[PDB]
């Protein structure tokens, strides 16, 4: 309820102020007178997507520290971060981070 009302107020104020900005100077009269598709940017976007997926895997860490199985969770988190570093290293050594 409160969050819905806050978002609605933000959107309403932004819309009102942008529209008055776009319409206040529209009342007075004036004159009123490709291909390249670089591959590197796509690789940057795909690398961002994959790293974002691995980050999403890393996100439940603050709650995983209270499990009473500390050794197993530490091993698994270190494993995830090690494979993240391995992905970065593989893309580094295969000339995937060049311009």
């Amino acid at each position: 309820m409160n969050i819905m009302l806050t978002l609605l107020t933000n959107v309403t104020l932004a819309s009102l102020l942008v529209l008055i900005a776009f319409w206040l100077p529209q009342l007075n009269a004036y004159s009123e007178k490709r291909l390249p598709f670089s591959m590197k940017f796509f690789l940057v976007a795909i690398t961002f997507l994959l790293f974002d997926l691995e980050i999403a895997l890393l996100l439940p860490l603050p709650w995983a520290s209270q499990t009473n199985n500390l050794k197993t969770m530490l091993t698994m988190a270190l494993f995830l971060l090690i494979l993240l570093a391995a992905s970065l290293a593989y893309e580094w050594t295969q000339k995937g981070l060049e311009w």
Partner: protein, 83 residues
């Protein structure tokens, strides 16, 4: 041994960030298995009561189960207080 020392000295120059990263990562991997306080962390996690401790039906054969919380029987948390 000389080759490894030369490699480390050459990597510390012109690549300090990677050397620091590998050192920190290796230390983070190695040290937890050697520190004695990880068992303390496990024990602290054990002592955090999230659930209601359901009492047991007394049958006269549980001298280790306290009848009242103030009774000396049961686990203690003096070690946690001393920490």
């Amino acid at each position: 041994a000389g080759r490894i020392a030369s490699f480390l000295k050459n990597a510390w120059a012109k690549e300090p960030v990677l050397v620091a990263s590998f050192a920190i990562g290796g230390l983070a991997i190695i040290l937890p298995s050697l520190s004695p306080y990880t068992n303390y962390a496990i024990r602290i996690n054990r002592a955090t009561p999230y659930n209601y401790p359901v009492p047991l039906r007394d049958d006269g054969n549980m001298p280790d189960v306290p009848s009242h919380p103030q009774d000396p029987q049961g686990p203690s948390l003096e070690w946690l207080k001393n920490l």
